[PDB]
Amino acid sequence: GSSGSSGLTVGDWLDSIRMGRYRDHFAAGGYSSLGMVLRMNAQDVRALGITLMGHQKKILGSIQTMRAQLTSTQGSGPSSG
Fold this sequence. Notes:
- By secondary structure, this protein is mainly alpha-helical.
- It has one domain (1-81): Orthogonal Bundle (DNA polymerase, domain 1).
- Helix content is 52%, strand content 0%.
- The protein has five helices and no strands.
- The longest helix has 18 residues, at 53-70.
- Residues 8-69 form the SAM domain.
- It is found in: Cell membrane; Cell projection; Early endosome membrane.
């Protein structure tokens, strides 16, 4: 998967960071899977309704890392240290 591989639901992932509560939102913003969530950003997330820095950071920060692994750059990524 070069573009983006899907496996779980916006809920499963979000749940990891205890943000699944916003899941419903993603589905409304046109995001029902991760394949698209990985290609999302503050611009997209914000639209979902999640603006609270306390949360926005989780979702976004949780995605930026979810995709960062798909393709590293100048170093390792998937590696769990």
